[PDB]
Ligand binder design. Sequence first.
Ligand SMILES: CO[C@H]1O[C@H](CO)[C@H](O)[C@H](O)[C@H]1O
Ligand SMILES: CO[C@H]1O[C@H](CO)[C@H](O)[C@H](O)[C@H]1O
Ligand SMILES: CO[C@H]1O[C@H](CO)[C@H](O)[C@H](O)[C@H]1O
Ligand SMILES: CO[C@H]1O[C@H](CO)[C@H](O)[C@H](O)[C@H]1O
Ligand SMILES: CO[C@H]1O[C@H](CO)[C@H](O)[C@H](O)[C@H]1O
Ligand SMILES: [Ca+2]
Ligand SMILES: [Ca+2]
Ligand SMILES: [Ca+2]
Ligand SMILES: [Ca+2]
Ligand SMILES: [Ca+2]
Ligand SMILES: [Mg+2]
Ligand SMILES: [Mg+2]
Length: 432
Amino acid sequence: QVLCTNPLDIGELRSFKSKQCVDIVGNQGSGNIATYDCDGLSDQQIIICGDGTIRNEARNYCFTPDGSGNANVMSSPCTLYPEIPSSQRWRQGRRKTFTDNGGIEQVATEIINLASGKCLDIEGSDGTGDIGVYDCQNLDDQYFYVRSRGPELFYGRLRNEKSDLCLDVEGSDGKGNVLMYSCEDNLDQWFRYYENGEIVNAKSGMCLDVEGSDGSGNVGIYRCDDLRDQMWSRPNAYCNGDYCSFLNKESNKCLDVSGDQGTGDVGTWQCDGLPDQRFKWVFDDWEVPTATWNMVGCDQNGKVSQQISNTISFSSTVTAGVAVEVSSTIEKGVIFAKATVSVKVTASLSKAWTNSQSGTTAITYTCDNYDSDEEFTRGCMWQLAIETTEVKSGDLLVWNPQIVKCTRSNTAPGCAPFTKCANEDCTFCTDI
Ligand SMILES: CO[C@H]1O[C@H](CO)[C@H](O)[C@H](O)[C@H]1O
Ligand SMILES: CO[C@H]1O[C@H](CO)[C@H](O)[C@H](O)[C@H]1O
Ligand SMILES: CO[C@H]1O[C@H](CO)[C@H](O)[C@H](O)[C@H]1O
Ligand SMILES: CO[C@H]1O[C@H](CO)[C@H](O)[C@H](O)[C@H]1O
Ligand SMILES: CO[C@H]1O[C@H](CO)[C@H](O)[C@H](O)[C@H]1O
Ligand SMILES: [Ca+2]
Ligand SMILES: [Ca+2]
Ligand SMILES: [Ca+2]
Ligand SMILES: [Ca+2]
Ligand SMILES: [Ca+2]
Ligand SMILES: [Mg+2]
Ligand SMILES: [Mg+2]
């Protein structure tokens, strides 16, 4: 009945060993956990909760050992009352850092069960197969990273310099062949471009891909596979103002339109410096969002319990189009107490925003512990507010997600959302 209100990170949880995703069977967010190909579905968006639980965006279920000893791990109902049991709580152990093939620094850690002290584990040694708990053995297949794409660099539709047409996916489900088409106010034409080189379709969550593996061929949308032929550079040398070429990292060929009129099928071709090989990002300006905490309630002589709703205020309906613009804006950068936040904060916040769009879900939430972990005996409950302005109109948007910090202080938490209060009064932070 109660979602995770103090999340620390949201994204794919990956094996340090194989780089495969930690996967719940099917797409509903319940059932056995094992490694699988990363597939872009919401059940693979794992939520690292500040309360120790590990949940997912498909359903409010918890990573749960099916018994004592070296047991199987599955996604099962979370036990919240009288308290979350230590068997459904996990801590990060030892850490391993590495740079992935997209050039992004990742941080892997052991994931340790609080009841048993056993490690989240993949069968055998190769980092593929069934997932459960086992004695910690220091091996790579007991280390897991929440995947970072690096910074979101650019976003929007992609308009060809020659034709004024937009980069398009056939149909409207964001799947299949990419070609030029009339610019349309549909998600299947909206793309988000990351430091890891991925260009991601907003409708399908899938990647701008070249057929086969050599980076020379027809371009379409396919399962993000982390391969070099789905990585793209946007080098300054090829930019003319805001119109730039996109070079495939596998073949060094340019994102290209058939012929020279900017009107046909899209593939990769030898770069030629012609206008049909340049594209501009088309998007509305929104102000860098700001994060603040609002007091929901205080109790100096015990716990505080409140109704916590997801609310959004704006000048008009937050359309699917407005929602992807805001998501993209958030991921690009957010300010907290006049400082930027880390890549995982903006990535997680934008994922929370997206998941917030179809309800939600007013909840009765109680401050049982301080965000810093100690038992809550007095203080205040604080709810996040995210604010931004659409520059063209001057219209302010305010989002109050179901994201809460419990602290001992009447002073607002000193920590960004998706970071952990280090002390009861929350004056400094960890897990930033
Ligand atoms: C056929 O795929 C389905 O089940 C597998 C496990 O077999 C994965 O969980 C995948 O995400 C889900 O869509
Ligand atoms: C028999 O040991 C093997 O399987 C267990 C789980 O059964 C663990 O994955 C362990 O690391 C692996 O060496
Ligand atoms: C009937 O048009 C449909 O397919 C074309 C491609 O032929 C475009 O992708 C358009 O967005 C879609 O509605
Ligand atoms: C059959 O798979 C191959 O082609 C598809 C396009 O059909 C993708 O590019 C994939 O990466 C590649 O391995
Ligand atoms: C035969 O060349 C023509 O088509 C190819 C793709 O087939 C490229 O678009 C190239 O720029 C164009 O001159
Ligand atoms: Ca799945
Ligand atoms: Ca193992
Ligand atoms: Ca289309
Ligand atoms: Ca491919
Ligand atoms: Ca061409
Ligand atoms: Mg399992
Ligand atoms: Mg194509």
